Design a protein around this ligand. Sequence first.
Ligand SMILES: *[C@@H]1O[C@H](CO)[C@@H](O)[C@H](O)[C@H]1NC(C)=O
Lengths: 192, 125
Amino acid sequence: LCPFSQVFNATRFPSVYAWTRERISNCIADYSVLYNSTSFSTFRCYGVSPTKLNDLCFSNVYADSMVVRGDEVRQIAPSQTGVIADYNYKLPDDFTGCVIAWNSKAKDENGQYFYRLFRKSKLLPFQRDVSNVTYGSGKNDGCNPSEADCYWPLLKYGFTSSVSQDYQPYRVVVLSFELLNAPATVCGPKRS
Amino acid sequence: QLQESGGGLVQPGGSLRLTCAPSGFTLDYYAIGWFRQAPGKEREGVSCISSNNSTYYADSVKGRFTISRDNAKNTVYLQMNSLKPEDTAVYYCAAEPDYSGVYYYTCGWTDFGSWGQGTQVTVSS
Ligand SMILES: *[C@@H]1O[C@H](CO)[C@@H](O)[C@H](O)[C@H]1NC(C)=O
């Protein structure tokens, strides 16, 4: 049985710009027992029927995780626009996997969480950018932040206790499935 | 932008048809959901349909509510039949781009960025 508890029930989660990857391998994955957490505000899948997940096998499964805002969870999906999906975490158009999200104001309100506002270009799918070099609007990067037109590219989220649910922290975990010409490492109950 | 019509006052067991109407875009490559918000309580997802024509329904409405898209008439209607008092709330429709097909295990407000203003639905006698 796959260690889904250690991903979803983890005490700490990454900033979306510094999203973490965990590898699920050599285990049986009953996704329907993962569902039963009614805390899930979001549970959508792409390229696979969620009923049919119990009978599929994959060569490699990854579990990426991050903290974004309620009104940004919609951006964690294929072929989407936004500051998160273009500078923090991008998904391929042919994405095969699932996106799960839940409200985490209980654990992440008053938490040091960041996202990337400025970038020279959009992320390639599954790219990660941990750079903290100053961004020059019209200027060259690496300029002095005290000067004008020069900003730090990473901004804190500010998950105050009075904001609307659209602004509160939500923890997202993205399971991505792939099966190539390689042996299987993850299988459902029906196809063990 | 989404325009919503069809709500109103209905006796227990009656019928209602909620309409959701897009302006300025086509619902062909979009996913549309119907959401209700009772007084105080949080926006619950009632029924959603993706471009896949794959659908979701809340467990409490499963046998009684029906979502449908008219990709030619650019309308998405929720048929609300066998109405219960528990069904009284403000109903919003929502729309999200869905260029690749979505499959919902659940449907939530966290899944849509465009919303309507709401229609009031009341089931009483
Ligand atoms: C970026 O660098 C500045 C200056 O070193 C620092 O104050 C800030 O906390 C950093 N932000 C990060 C690492 O997210």
